[PDB]
Amino acid sequence: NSQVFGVARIYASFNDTFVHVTDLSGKETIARVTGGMKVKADRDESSPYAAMLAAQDVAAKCKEVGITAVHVKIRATGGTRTKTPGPGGQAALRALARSGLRIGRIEDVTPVPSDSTRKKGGRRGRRL
Amino acid sequence: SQESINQKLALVIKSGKYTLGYKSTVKSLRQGKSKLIIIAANTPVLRKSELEYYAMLSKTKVYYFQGGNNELGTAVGKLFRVGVVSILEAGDSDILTTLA
Amino acid sequence: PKKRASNGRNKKGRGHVKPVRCVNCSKSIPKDKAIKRMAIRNIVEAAAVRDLSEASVYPEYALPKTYNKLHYCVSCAIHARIVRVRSREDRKNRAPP
Amino acid sequence: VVDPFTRKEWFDIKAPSTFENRNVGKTLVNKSTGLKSASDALKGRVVEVCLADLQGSEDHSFRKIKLRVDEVQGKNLLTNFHGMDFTTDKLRSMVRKWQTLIEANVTVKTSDDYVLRIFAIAFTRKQANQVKRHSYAQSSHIRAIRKVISEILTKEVQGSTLAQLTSKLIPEVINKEIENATKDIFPLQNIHVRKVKLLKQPKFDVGALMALHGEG
Amino acid sequence: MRAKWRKKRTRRLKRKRRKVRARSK
Amino acid sequence: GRGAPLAKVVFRDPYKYRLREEIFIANEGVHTGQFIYAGKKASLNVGNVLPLGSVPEGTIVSNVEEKPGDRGALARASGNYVIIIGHNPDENKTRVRLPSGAKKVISSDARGVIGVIAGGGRVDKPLLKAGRAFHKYRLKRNSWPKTRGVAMNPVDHPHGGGNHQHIGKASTISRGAVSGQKAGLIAARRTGLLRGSQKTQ
Amino acid sequence: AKRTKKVGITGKYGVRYGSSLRRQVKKLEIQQHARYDCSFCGKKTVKRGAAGIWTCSCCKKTVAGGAYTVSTAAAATVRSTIRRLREMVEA
RNA sequence: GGUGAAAUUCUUGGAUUUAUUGAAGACUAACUACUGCGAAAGCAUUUGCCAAGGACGUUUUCAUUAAUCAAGAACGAAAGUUAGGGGAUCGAAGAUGAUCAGAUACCGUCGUAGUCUUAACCAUAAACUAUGCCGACUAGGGAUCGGGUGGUGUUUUUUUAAUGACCCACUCGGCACCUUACGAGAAAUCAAAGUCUUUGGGUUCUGGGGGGAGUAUGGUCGCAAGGCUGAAACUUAAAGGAAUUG
Ligand SMILES: [Mg+2]
Ligand SMILES: [Mg+2]
Ligand SMILES: [Mg+2]
Ligand SMILES: [Mg+2]
Ligand SMILES: [Mg+2]
Ligand SMILES: [Mg+2]
Ligand SMILES: [Mg+2]
Ligand SMILES: [Mg+2]
Ligand SMILES: [Mg+2]
Ligand SMILES: [Mg+2]
Ligand SMILES: [Mg+2]
Ligand SMILES: [Mg+2]
Ligand SMILES: [Mg+2]
Ligand SMILES: [Mg+2]
Ligand SMILES: [Mg+2]
Ligand SMILES: [Mg+2]
Ligand SMILES: [Mg+2]
Ligand SMILES: [Mg+2]
Ligand SMILES: [Mg+2]
Ligand SMILES: [Mg+2]
Ligand SMILES: [Mg+2]
Ligand SMILES: [Mg+2]
Ligand SMILES: [Mg+2]
Ligand SMILES: [Mg+2]
Ligand SMILES: [Mg+2]
Ligand SMILES: [Mg+2]
Ligand SMILES: [Mg+2]
Ligand SMILES: [Mg+2]
Ligand SMILES: [Mg+2]
Ligand SMILES: [Mg+2]
Ligand SMILES: [Mg+2]
Ligand SMILES: [Mg+2]
Ligand SMILES: [Mg+2]
Ligand SMILES: [Mg+2]
Ligand SMILES: [Zn+2]
Ligand SMILES: [Zn+2]
């Protein structure tokens, strides 16, 4: 079966998309490029467009470094934040399997509390 | 299903015969009349060791009470305090033969 | 005059329940109130399973799922139409969709 | 400007013998230089692999194992068991409404001196003809169930070394032993040892590590 | 005006009349 | 002239038959007749003195040495103590946090005594009157009372002149300023009431 | 026959110095003047003299202590922090 | 980073992301529900100690010992208050970036007191069920929690009973729900908000058009903020409740 296994850690928030690949240990990252790099918008940093567009360069850089296979760990912002996956998160994962890189073992690692640390916005909400 | 200790000593107090205090227990420890000595946790290590060496000598059972001589005397149902209690006659109480 | 005989949502014999934080606006509403919706989905969503199962190693494998329990306040749930206003009588029915 | 990826070397990651497939994958470190050993940036690394990859079966689909490399030799790196966790997707699915969630944990040292915290998790189940909709436990049940599960955790871990525990977990002898003790009490669907955390590690001793690695 | 702030409005008044009465001791 | 008590600790002379008395700063709970064990192999009870390497992190200690065998330097004041943060067997070095809030790295052979200095809350009671501040410094040195520098004449001070008592130039003084220029706030990196609340990073 | 309402011991200070400091001193003065339980002899004979030192009037044991009270708050909590760390080492 | 869109802000001193380890303080997710407990406020990680509690079971005991309560007393969310500790997070004030005709705001950044704790204060919340307590009577339904009873019920282990767990029936006591309207009501609705002009079981409390006002005054408690007690002159034909059609 062979290949060589890296890990693609995809952090998709609602203002950006993160496509980050390291090896089986998170030390020594291979290729990291985000959505704000592929457009000048500030709004479209998080768009699925940039997310696909970012996963091109990673997978091009995975070949160039020689990583032929990826495990993917996907995360929202977490903590006291949204918890819902970001929009670019699906496009990025698709562009990675679409670029010829071999996938497997996907998990959702978004950090969840045991219920800590009072959340932003002050009990009356963010009202608009 | 467990009788504590003070509950045991309570029976000893109405139904038994006892003496209290460092003098009368050694007056009793010499004569052989004493089946138990209950030493307060806060009496000094010398009085503990002289009581010890009066006991191991006499083949007398030594209970190391958990508490001070204030709570010890309340446990024998007295208003003053006592550092050591000596059991002469066990009454309806089983203290000698129990786990203690 | 009184609108719902449940007032807000269900308490009836407690008198205080900790609040929860709205997931949209970050409001405070007692957990007894606060519309809650279970959110389960596949990690690969819809069209990607094709290109995911092809690019993937392993025969088969399986699709993991994202499990999230959403809490809204009354304001956001109404506005997001996670719920909507019903008729005087239809309001009484607590039965699901 | 260097494109540093022609600098670094490659090393092949080796799993413990307590597992099946012992070649995990690879990883890169910069080329050893004067006053930088590539063994330094190599050592402390920890790798999280699925136990399905390790044992080869898909019955282990969740159950991740952490693997920490203690030493590196000649392009190979020897890793030891650093812990186990449950893959949040699997964990979330097993939590459902209308049932009692019971959790328990204990901290215990093994025969070789390893201080471990191990976690357990179980859920009540309806059974057979039961027409009531929930099947919650009484508080008195959970107290005695937690007492029993921890009794077994401390017992199974106490006599054993780091490898025996590993060798016990793959078959899940603990889960079954838990179900046996608990069924006198309450139905208790699922059951797992869902996590094990390394707290304290003994002094190095390459000898035990070579006995685990190496020979085969 | 909203009944809480009219309750605040008259709370301030009462403080100021206590201060003014405190002039003459 | 010392808040906190001292406790007089009697030892046997190792190389001659005689008693050798030592004067120790009582550590709050130390008591007459208690036994006090001193050295690397001492136990972890309060009032014994250990080397700094020989205690775990989290250990709170008093009268700790700056260099080993200087018979104590850091945290001798009534109520004070030093916490051991960590150890570094590369050259025998324990790093500790000093009551000022600062973090110091000393040699793990540096001795300290288990616990805090006794004498508790002395500075929490209001002096209440000058006569109390008087007797206070009587036993200490002649630093009291203090006449303000603005109250003196230009000859007597930089705060100096008059017609209005005022400082009339910045009361923060260059570090490198010459003795007789230095009064008021000296090296101050800042001034004003801060409200910051963090005594260390 | 209750004498003072508020001041108690601090009626010695009369009107002076301001109440807030008279209150604040009331606190610590009752503490330092108070009689305490002895660890060794089990009676309440311990008095202060010379703040920091607390001796027992019966058994003559003298203990380093807090300024105006026998045990310091942060002392006793340190007392346990050490026992806690010492038991780690011997077990 | 952040937003609807921006900006203030942070960054080749490597910001953001990744990794290994550690520090602090708070919180206690999912399980968590028309479920539990407490007089109310309130109460959710484990284990140990401390005294407490309802209901149930009872051919046990005492024998009217009670019900309700001016005065009087305990407890009392949050904010706030006094000393000390703590100070991660959020965040009144303040300061900022924007929006805007203005924007002291709503949205963004920074952040003081605060939020946590010890020992003291304070005694208020739409502290709500906007519904006093004790007692009796009047109607149907199925779930659920705690206890008990009844079974040649079921499922459990070497089938051995047990104990468990489940199922069916019964019954006390609970948190609730559903139908009904004999009855009640201005109606909304109510299983009490019924058994009231055919008006009476016992008892505490409060209201008497709207304003002025919960103000003024005196008294009292409180460190203060304030609480409790609490007027009148004058003013005015409506204010208000529920339902209906636009
Ligand atoms: Mg951006
Ligand atoms: Mg903020
Ligand atoms: Mg704001
Ligand atoms: Mg809105
Ligand atoms: Mg309305
Ligand atoms: Mg309430
Ligand atoms: Mg002088
Ligand atoms: Mg001065
Ligand atoms: Mg002066
Ligand atoms: Mg002059
Ligand atoms: Mg001059
Ligand atoms: Mg000058
Ligand atoms: Mg001047
Ligand atoms: Mg002046
Ligand atoms: Mg001046
Ligand atoms: Mg008199
Ligand atoms: Mg939990
Ligand atoms: Mg429950
Ligand atoms: Mg409060
Ligand atoms: Mg407060
Ligand atoms: Mg404070
Ligand atoms: Mg703070
Ligand atoms: Mg402002
Ligand atoms: Mg203020
Ligand atoms: Mg009734
Ligand atoms: Mg019924
Ligand atoms: Mg049966
Ligand atoms: Mg079986
Ligand atoms: Mg109930
Ligand atoms: Mg009729
Ligand atoms: Mg009515
Ligand atoms: Mg009238
Ligand atoms: Mg009126
Ligand atoms: Mg009127
Ligand atoms: Zn909302
Ligand atoms: Zn004494």
Swiss-Prot record, chain B:
GO terms for cellular component: cytoplasm; cytosol; cytosolic large ribosomal subunit. It is found in: Cytoplasm. Present with 59300 molecules/cell in log phase SD medium. Component of the large ribosomal subunit (LSU). Mature yeast ribosomes consist of a small (40S) and a large (60S) subunit. The 40S small subunit contains 1 molecule of ribosomal RNA (18S rRNA) and 33 different proteins (encoded by 57 genes). The large 60S subunit contains 3 rRNA molecules (25S, 5.8S and 5S rRNA) and 46 different proteins (encoded by 81 genes). Belongs to the eukaryotic ribosomal protein eL30 family. This is Large ribosomal subunit protein eL30. One of its GO terms (biological process) is negative regulation of mRNA splicing, via spliceosome. Component of the ribosome, a large ribonucleoprotein complex responsible for the synthesis of proteins in the cell. The small ribosomal subunit (SSU) binds messenger RNAs (mRNAs) and translates the encoded message by selecting cognate aminoacyl-transfer RNA (tRNA) molecules. The large subunit (LSU) contains the ribosomal catalytic site termed the peptidyl transferase center (PTC), which catalyzes the formation of peptide bonds, thereby polymerizing the amino acids delivered by tRNAs into a polypeptide chain. One of its GO terms (molecular function) is pre-mRNA 5'-splice site binding. Its main location: cytoplasm. It comes from the Eukaryota. Coiled coil: none annotated. The gene is RPL30. Pfam families: Ribosomal_L7Ae. There is a cross-link at K17, K48, K78 (Glycyl lysine isopeptide (Lys-Gly) (interchain with G-Cter in ubiquitin)).
UniProtKB/Swiss-Prot annotation, chain C:
The keyword Translocase does not apply. It is found in: Cytoplasm. GO terms for cellular component: 90S preribosome; cytosol; cytosolic small ribosomal subunit. Residues 1-19 are annotated as: Disordered. Keywords: Cytoplasm, Ribonucleoprotein, Ribosomal protein. It comes from the Eukaryota. GO terms for molecular function: mRNA binding; structural constituent of ribosome. One of its GO terms (biological process) is cytoplasmic translation. Its main location: cytoplasm. Component of the ribosome, a large ribonucleoprotein complex responsible for the synthesis of proteins in the cell. The small ribosomal subunit (SSU) binds messenger RNAs (mRNAs) and translates the encoded message by selecting cognate aminoacyl-transfer RNA (tRNA) molecules. The large subunit (LSU) contains the ribosomal catalytic site termed the peptidyl transferase center (PTC), which catalyzes the formation of peptide bonds, thereby polymerizing the amino acids delivered by tRNAs into a polypeptide chain. Belongs to the eukaryotic ribosomal protein eS26 family. Present with 503000 molecules/cell in log phase SD medium. There are 2 genes for eS26 in yeast. This is Small ribosomal subunit protein eS26B. It comes from Saccharomyces cerevisiae (strain ATCC 204508 / S288c). The gene is RPS26B. The chain holds residues 2 to 98 of 119 of the full protein.
Swiss-Prot record, chain E:
One of its GO terms (biological process) is cytoplasmic translation. Keywords: Cytoplasm, Ribonucleoprotein, Ribosomal protein. Component of the ribosome, a large ribonucleoprotein complex responsible for the synthesis of proteins in the cell. The small ribosomal subunit (SSU) binds messenger RNAs (mRNAs) and translates the encoded message by selecting cognate aminoacyl-transfer RNA (tRNA) molecules. The large subunit (LSU) contains the ribosomal catalytic site termed the peptidyl transferase center (PTC), which catalyzes the formation of peptide bonds, thereby polymerizing the amino acids delivered by tRNAs into a polypeptide chain. It comes from the Eukaryota. It is found in: Cytoplasm. GO terms for molecular function: structural constituent of ribosome. Belongs to the eukaryotic ribosomal protein eS32 family. Residues 1-25 are annotated as: Disordered. The gene is RPL41A. GO terms for cellular component: cytosol; cytosolic large ribosomal subunit. This is Small ribosomal subunit protein eS32A.
Curated annotation (Swiss-Prot), chain F:
It is found in: Cytoplasm. The modification Phosphoserine is found at S43, S107, S108, S197. One of its GO terms (molecular function) is rRNA binding. There is a cross-link at K41, K67, K93 (Glycyl lysine isopeptide (Lys-Gly) (interchain with G-Cter in ubiquitin)). The keyword Ubl conjugation applies. It comes from the Eukaryota. GO terms for biological process: cytoplasmic translation; maintenance of translational fidelity; ribosomal large subunit biogenesis. Keywords: Cytoplasm, Isopeptide bond, Phosphoprotein, Ribonucleoprotein, Ribosomal protein, RNA-binding, rRNA-binding, Ubl conjugation. One of its GO terms (cellular component) is cytosol. Belongs to the universal ribosomal protein uL2 family. Component of the large ribosomal subunit (LSU). Mature yeast ribosomes consist of a small (40S) and a large (60S) subunit. The 40S small subunit contains 1 molecule of ribosomal RNA (18S rRNA) and 33 different proteins (encoded by 57 genes). The large 60S subunit contains 3 rRNA molecules (25S, 5.8S and 5S rRNA) and 46 different proteins (encoded by 81 genes). Component of the ribosome, a large ribonucleoprotein complex responsible for the synthesis of proteins in the cell. The small ribosomal subunit (SSU) binds messenger RNAs (mRNAs) and translates the encoded message by selecting cognate aminoacyl-transfer RNA (tRNA) molecules. The large subunit (LSU) contains the ribosomal catalytic site termed the peptidyl transferase center (PTC), which catalyzes the formation of peptide bonds, thereby polymerizing the amino acids delivered by tRNAs into a polypeptide chain. The chain holds residues 53 to 253 of 254 of the full protein.
